[PDB]
Nucleic acid binder design. Structure first.
Ligand SMILES: [K+]
Ligand SMILES: [K+]
Ligand SMILES: [K+]
Ligand SMILES: [K+]
Ligand SMILES: [K+]
Ligand SMILES: [K+]
Ligand SMILES: [K+]
Ligand SMILES: [K+]
Ligand SMILES: [K+]
Ligand SMILES: [K+]
Ligand SMILES: [K+]
Ligand SMILES: [K+]
Ligand SMILES: [K+]
Ligand SMILES: [K+]
Ligand SMILES: [K+]
Ligand SMILES: [K+]
Ligand SMILES: [K+]
Ligand SMILES: [K+]
Ligand SMILES: [K+]
Ligand SMILES: [K+]
Ligand SMILES: [K+]
Ligand SMILES: [K+]
Ligand SMILES: [K+]
Ligand SMILES: [K+]
Ligand SMILES: [K+]
Ligand SMILES: [K+]
Ligand SMILES: [K+]
Ligand SMILES: [K+]
Ligand SMILES: [K+]
Ligand SMILES: [K+]
Ligand SMILES: [K+]
Ligand SMILES: [Mg+2]
Ligand SMILES: [Mg+2]
Ligand SMILES: [Mg+2]
Ligand SMILES: [Mg+2]
Ligand SMILES: [Mg+2]
Ligand SMILES: [Mg+2]
Ligand SMILES: [Mg+2]
Ligand SMILES: [Mg+2]
Ligand SMILES: [Mg+2]
Ligand SMILES: [Mg+2]
Ligand SMILES: [Mg+2]
Ligand SMILES: [Mg+2]
Ligand SMILES: [Mg+2]
Ligand SMILES: [Mg+2]
Ligand SMILES: [Mg+2]
Ligand SMILES: [Mg+2]
Ligand SMILES: [Mg+2]
Ligand SMILES: [Mg+2]
Ligand SMILES: [Zn+2]
Lengths: 142, 128, 140, 101
RNA sequence: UGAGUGCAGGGUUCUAGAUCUGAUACAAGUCGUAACAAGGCAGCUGUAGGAGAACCUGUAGCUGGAUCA
RNA sequence: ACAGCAGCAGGCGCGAAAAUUACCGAAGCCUCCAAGAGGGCGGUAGUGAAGAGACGUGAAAACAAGUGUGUGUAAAAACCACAUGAGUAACUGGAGGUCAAGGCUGGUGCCAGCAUCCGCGGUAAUACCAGCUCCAGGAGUGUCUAUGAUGAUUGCUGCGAUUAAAAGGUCCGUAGUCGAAGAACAGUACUUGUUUGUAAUGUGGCUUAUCGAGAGCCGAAUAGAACGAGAAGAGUUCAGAGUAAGGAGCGAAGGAGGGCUAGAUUAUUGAGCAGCGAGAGGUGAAAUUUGAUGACCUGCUUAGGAGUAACAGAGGCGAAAGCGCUAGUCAAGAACGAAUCCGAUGAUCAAGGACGUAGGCUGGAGGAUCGAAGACGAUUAGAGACCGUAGUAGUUCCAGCAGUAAACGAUGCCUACGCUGUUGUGGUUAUGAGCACGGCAGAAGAGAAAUCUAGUAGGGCUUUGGGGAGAGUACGCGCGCAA
């Protein structure tokens, strides 16, 4: 089940059985690889890179053509971010809640949501600072 | 998450009680395969197919009329060859028939083979 | 607590559970040496100081014959029962008596006698059964 | 022992509900438990409609009705005989009552 | 190296004490009758006042209710 | 001046509790300068129903225990051999049920007594006190006290927690215990071989004292350690692998979920003014009470502070406590659709932290309605109560403290396996159906039943009960302004 609440949803998307090569498409390998690195330098998250490749350029799951994963390609090109993108999105939501509570101090429901959010940050931090993906003395922006 | 060897047992026990002849079992591990293959050698189950679904794994099996009950033991206790008959007398209905399965350096073996090979091991499960 | 490497947790839990048993608790945590007859001694010597009688509990209707004893080993004074038909007549003030338990698990009242916990066994070194049935005589 | 499967009230999947006040004694009772009664009563009694037909100035007239929903606590509903005690098998039967006039 | 012994303190276990206050047993004493039937104001849980005494009254809750409607 | 029996005998005390101020150039050992000397160490008997063997108390013809010789020993006694006399030898607890065995005869009349427990006796006692017959074990049988079993009433094997005793008010969270599939790898646990490691006791045997305990000889052995071996489970790693494991993100939509800003239709009270001219209120029935200083009722004006009727439900939302007028605004969450991204990030939780109806407390704002306390009127033997009149703290808001509820579906949280019909709510749809959250009615199993959040089961983790009472009380400690 869900980690912070009583949810038991089941909405996911199916991974294919085999992957082949997308011969119906209208670009070369080298063009697709160029499209990714452009979208990266403009500052898009890698989950959004995937959405665009599927929706506009017509490639499912973005790996059948490249034999390599999106984040690994960005490390080969040297475009790696300073913080992993998951930990980064958790710090953003915390900041937002603290900026709301700063002006609407009375909101007990928002107070409740903040302590849940903050717990999740530290649990994710401890993962990354074991795999050597963050400096040992990293601390939140707060 | 449930233990995979426990899940296997409850799935076949309930279906047998409901008088079904075949079932699909949904999460499979290496020792689950070896357990089922043991029940086939002693003629408790008849036909086995394994589905390679890339999501864990699953099996389809045909039950015989000879199977009354099976079960897993948790945890998997360590036993000397001196100890196994104690567990045999606790689990099985009669001195004449049924099988207690033990894991060893020589694979899965039954309580008779333990005497032949001169080896203890870890207790895994039983059927009769 | 049923894991294979859980022995320490399991042991500490199960030990703590036993204090719910009255028997284990009293031996561990009560005053087991407060009594004239009990854990300490099977019999007790003492001197008779007063003669006494008590009513039986309902629904019975009787006067039971009892004796006030000063116990040599503790300097407590206790009530004891005198068993036999004419038994009270075999005892004088300032006699020495030996005293015995009623046979329950803890020191508890037996039958219809309220609050009395011991009985007389011998008077002046001789069996009370022999005195009452006139098989033997007082030392004099 | 437990006398009714629904605890005598219609609350499910909720913590708490609004209270209402009894028509007969003003006691507080939870809305999901209160005995309810509907009334549709003519302003003019049946024994006067034959006089109304000669009293009115209009060519035809429709009498105005008055509408009410009433609420009762258990004690009042039993005492006023809106409901009655029933046998162990009858207790389970559920049927809508008539609108009063 | 040190036995013994001065003087202050602590740590333990027992024991005295004017007087006050619990509990238990009281064949059957005195005053009421609070609960068990709609027990004669349906009962019970929390909280706050009050009162010879059981208890009574406000406020929120529960049915183990006298209603599965 | 001398002296220290937890050496051997012995005495006094203390207790419910324990032997002779005995013989010893012999047996087993130790000590010396020794073909010898020493030893209360050790051996021999005496005393005692702590324990353990074998046998007497007659047979149908014909029976212990005595005695004398020899033996035996260091000297003895007992034991054994032969020979003499003979004719001796049972008690303890019971007889209503459990529990084997008498309604037998005489006394006693809720007395005297008996009875582990249940129970007997008030003049017809199979239960008391005795006589007589039976029963049980028998050189033994009763009682008291500790303990093991009884007992699955301590539960690893193996108990319980809807109503009998028993799931923390809700979340977060550390220590602790527990943790995918696929392909490979390594040997410290794990299991096993060989070798060590046990005198007595115990275990499997055989041999000699008339027999039986006894004595003598044999064989194997626990835990612990030394060196090898096997690799299923456990462990470590990898990525042309991507959970009906989790987190991040995208698209369209739904809800009394929460904070803030600005508005609203009535209603209940209070004042002003106008009309009218005698009662209004309240109850089962009435009295307190209010009205010619004009009530009540009907108009028009105003002033406040609460609340959101009907629609409205076995409907919805929230972690729980809880949430119902209309617009605008601010954050985050649940579910659904689908070829998005990362890759074990996870389950449960002592300590520690955050929320928690109502009533209560500290300070400010305010004050319509309702109303603890207090005061009256009735009713009653008495009402201090129930009913009526009136009336204060509180009831509302902001900033905090507090920490309890029949905080209940009296049913912990994850995760499984499971029959049918019907009815809802929100998305999606090959229009056949699904996914999440519910209600209802049977069935089969289950259970002491009632009934079923209770079916099946050695899955994981925490809380928790052990006949009533005393007691959720005393002492100590921690929080709180107090309660
Ligand atoms: K999600
Ligand atoms: K959790
Ligand atoms: K939560
Ligand atoms: K959860
Ligand atoms: K009795
Ligand atoms: K509630
Ligand atoms: K109802
Ligand atoms: K009452
Ligand atoms: K000495
Ligand atoms: K001595
Ligand atoms: K003795
Ligand atoms: K002898
Ligand atoms: K006898
Ligand atoms: K007799
Ligand atoms: K008689
Ligand atoms: K017990
Ligand atoms: K158990
Ligand atoms: K609590
Ligand atoms: K996955
Ligand atoms: K809003
Ligand atoms: K409050
Ligand atoms: K009053
Ligand atoms: K009066
Ligand atoms: K009143
Ligand atoms: K009032
Ligand atoms: K608080
Ligand atoms: K608090
Ligand atoms: K509580
Ligand atoms: K729910
Ligand atoms: K049960
Ligand atoms: K206290
Ligand atoms: Mg009464
Ligand atoms: Mg009453
Ligand atoms: Mg009842
Ligand atoms: Mg000696
Ligand atoms: Mg008999
Ligand atoms: Mg008898
Ligand atoms: Mg039990
Ligand atoms: Mg009860
Ligand atoms: Mg209970
Ligand atoms: Mg509880
Ligand atoms: Mg022999
Ligand atoms: Mg493995
Ligand atoms: Mg006027
Ligand atoms: Mg409305
Ligand atoms: Mg979400
Ligand atoms: Mg308040
Ligand atoms: Mg919990
Ligand atoms: Mg108890
Ligand atoms: Zn009412």
């Amino acid at each position: 089940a869900r980690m912070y609440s009583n949810g038991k949803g089941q909405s996911k998307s199916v991974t294919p059985y085999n992957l082949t090569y997308p011969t119906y498409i209208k670009h070369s390998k080298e063009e697709i690889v160029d499209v990714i690195l452009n979208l990266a330098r403009k500052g898009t998250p890698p989950s959004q890179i995937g959405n665009i490749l599927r929706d506009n350029y017509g490639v499912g799951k973005s790996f059948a053509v490249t034999k390599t994963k999106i984040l690994t390609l960005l490390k080969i090109a040297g475009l790696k971010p300073v913080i992993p993108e998951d930990l980064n999105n958790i710090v953003k939501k915390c900041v937002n809640i603290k900026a709301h509570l700063a002006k609407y101090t009375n909101d007990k429901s928002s107070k409740y949501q903040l302590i849940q959010m903050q717990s999740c940050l530290y649990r994710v931090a401890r993962y990354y600072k074991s795999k050597n993906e963050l400096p040992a003395g990293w601390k939140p922006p707060f | 998450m449930m233990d995979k060897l426990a899940n296997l047992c409850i799935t076949i026990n309930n279906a047998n009680r409901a008088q079904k002849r075949s079932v699909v079992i949904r999460r499979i591990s290496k020792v689950c395969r070896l357990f089922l293959e043991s029940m086939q050698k002693h003629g408790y189950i008849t036909d086995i197919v394994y589905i390679d679904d890339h999501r864990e794994g699953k099996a389809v099996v045909g039950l015989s009329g000879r199977l009354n009950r099976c079960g897993a033991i948790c945890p998997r206790y360590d036993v000397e060859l001196k100890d196994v008959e104690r567990y045999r007398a606790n689990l099985l209905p009669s001195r004449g028939f049924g099988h207690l399965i033990v894991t060893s350096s020589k694979g899965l073996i039954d309580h008779r083979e333990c005497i032949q090979h001169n080896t203890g091991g870890k207790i895994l499960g039983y059927f009769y | 607590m049923y894991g294979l490497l859980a022995a320490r947790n399991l042991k500490k839990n199960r030990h703590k559970r036993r204090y719910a048993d009255k028997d284990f608790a009293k031996k561990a945590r009560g005053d087991i040496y407060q009594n004239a007859v009990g854990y300490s001694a099977p019999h007790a010597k003492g001197i008779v100081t007063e003669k006494l009688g008590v009513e039986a509990k309902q629904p019975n209707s009787a006067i039971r014959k009892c004796v006030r004893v000063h116990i040599v080993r503790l300097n407590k004074k206790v009530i004891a029962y005198v068993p036999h038909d004419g038994g009270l007549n075999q005892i004088e003030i300032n006699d020495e008596v030996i005293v015995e338990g009623l046979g329950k698990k803890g020191c508890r009242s037996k039958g219809d006698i309220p609050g009395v916990r011991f009985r007389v066994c011998k008077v002046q070194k001789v069996s009370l059964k022999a005195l009452v049935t006139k098989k033997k005589e007082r030392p004099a | 022992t437990k006398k009714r499967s629904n605890n005598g009230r219609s609350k499910k999947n909720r913590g708490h509900t609004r209270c209402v006040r009894c028509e007969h004694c003003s006691a507080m009772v939870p809305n999901d438990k209160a005995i309810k009664k509907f009334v549709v009563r003519s302003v003019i009694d049946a024994a006067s409609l034959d006089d109304l037909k000669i009293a009115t100035i209009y060519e035809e007239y429709e009498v105005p009705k008055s509408y009410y929903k009433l609420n009762y606590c258990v004690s009042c509903a039993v005492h006023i005989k809106l409901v009655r005690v029933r046998s162990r098998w009858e207790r389970k039967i559920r049927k809508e009552q008539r609108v009063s006039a």
